[PDB]
């Protein structure tokens, strides 16, 4: 049968998908999700989504599932760069940004955000790490404002670690904006809390 | 692509009902709520109640507990408000409203005047 | 509860300039959830303001909201003669919705 947990509430998505501001990709924005209700159909179906991928489950057996937890990690990158943001990738954001773990399971959504977020003169508060000295593992967030070598000497050198992107309407595809949803699953060896709308009975 | 329609209304007597339904269209009926508000004449808004239909849970405004129940039919994608016992005071506009998860926006109906009179 | 309390009551204003409508809620909330609406007599309210920010469809530049904690405003930036109404602020979270009173905003 259906018997699933007596949850009482619909879960706080609105906040994560169509928030009028977005974190930049070095300073990715954590939110948990826990005790309520979602219909993934919803989502899934609309045809907004330019990426929808999932690991480890299908998007049209999210509904029979619950979740131990689940977490939303969102930010915004350049449409070339969301090849990047994916297990098992490399690359200035998969190494120095935003790095998943290479067993994930979830799912990464994304979508265009020209309208939203380009500027006429270039939205220069979207800013992404060029420099490191090391990779970063996985769900790191790295903020600092630490500056990086060039020649062999202490800090031609001190490279500021940030560089924002000009974001205008003059971009080509690749250098729009894109709005990036990862949303990460806990499940099974728990007392899951994040329900899909079931019928339970008995 | 959210609409939300509503029936017109008259009452000829104090004491009586109205029953008002509000048809929600474009889709996700689900997963969404419904709340319900009045405008008295020369009054601002108030909110009375609502409800989420697939966990079908109704929670009233305090000033309304006793004479409005709120329901839901979801096979038919409506919601209804009924208000029972009606004293005159409450000659008004009700309108629903949905708000949908997955989003922050909130859709209006067109709110129908309730008039009670002899 | 969540009281949202608008001032000023009433505003005097030239068509042209510009002008704000403060709200301020008795405890702090989302930001996420307050909505600026407005109506001319004889209709529905007309949203403007979602999100305590992002600007309704079909609304104008003209109009921009901004705000956090229990202290939030809506901002016209030239008052065009289409834009004297009264204007409300709402909190719409799940347990509880509240409306304001509301201001009225006068041309003179």
């Known amino acids: 049968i259906v018997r699933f947990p007596n949850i009482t509430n619909l879960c706080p998505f609105g906040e994560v998908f169509n928030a009028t501001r977005f974190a930049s990709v070095y300073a990715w924005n954590r939110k948990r999700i826990s005790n309520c209700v979602a219909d993934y159909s919803v989502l899934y179906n609309s045809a907004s989504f330019s990426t929808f991928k999932c690991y480890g489950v299908s998007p049209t057996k999210l509904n029979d599932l619950c979740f131990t937890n689940v977490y939303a990690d969102s930010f915004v990158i350049r449409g070339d760069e969301v090849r990047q943001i994916a297990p098992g990738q490399t690359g200035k954001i998969a190494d120095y940004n935003y790095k998943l773990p290479d067993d994930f399971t979830g799912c990464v959504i994304a979508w265009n955000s020209n309208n939203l977020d380009s500027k006429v003169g270039g939205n220069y508060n979207y800013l992404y790490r060029l420099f490191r000295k090391s990779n970063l593992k996985p769900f790191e967030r790295d903020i600092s404002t630490e500056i990086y070598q060039a020649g062999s000497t202490p800090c031609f050198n001190c490279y500021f670690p940030l560089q924002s992107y000009g974001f205008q309407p003059t971009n080509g595809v690749g250098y729009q904006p894109y709005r990036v949803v990862v949303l990460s699953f806990e499940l099974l060896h728990a007392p899951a809390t994040v329900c899909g709308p079931k019928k339970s009975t008995n | 692509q959210v609409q939300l329609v509503q029936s017109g209304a008259e009452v000829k007597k104090p004491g009586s009902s109205v029953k008002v339904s509000c048809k929600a269209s474009?889709?996700?009926?689900?997963?969404?709520?419904i709340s319900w508000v009045r405008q008295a004449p020369g009054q601002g808004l108030e909110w009375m109640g609502g409800?989420?239909?697939?966990?079908?849970?109704?929670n009233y405004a305090q000033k309304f507990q006793g004479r409005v129940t709120i329901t839901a039919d979801k096979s038919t994608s409506t919601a209804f408000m009924e208000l029972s016992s009606l004293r005159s005071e409450d000659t008004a506009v009700y309108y629903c409203?949905?708000?949908?998860?997955?989003?922050?926006?909130?859709?209006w109906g067109q709110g129908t005047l309730v008039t009670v009179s002899s | 509860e969540i009281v949202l309390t608008q001032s000023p009551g009433t505003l005097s204003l030239s068509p042209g300039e510009r002008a704000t409508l403060s709200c301020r809620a008795s405890?702090?909330?989302?930001?996420?959830?307050l909505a600026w609406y407005q109506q001319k007599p004889g209709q529905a309210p007309r949203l403007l303001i979602y999100?305590?920010?992002s600007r309704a469809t079909g609304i104008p530049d003209r109009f921009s909201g901004s705000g956090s904690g229990t202290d939030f405003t809506l901002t016209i930036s030239r008052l065009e003669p289409e834009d004297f109404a009264v204007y409300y602020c709402?909190?719409?979270?799940?347990?509880?919705?509240?409306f304001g009173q509301g201001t009225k905003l006068e041309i003179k």
């Open positions: 409203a949905l708000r949908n998860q997955w989003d922050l926006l909130v859709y």
């Open positions: 474009g889709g996700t009926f689900s997963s969404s709520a």
């Open positions: 409800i989420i239909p697939i966990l079908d849970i109704t």
């Open positions: 405890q702090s909330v989302s930001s996420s959830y």
């Open positions: 999100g305590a920010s």
């Open positions: 709402q909190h719409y979270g799940s347990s509880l919705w509240t």
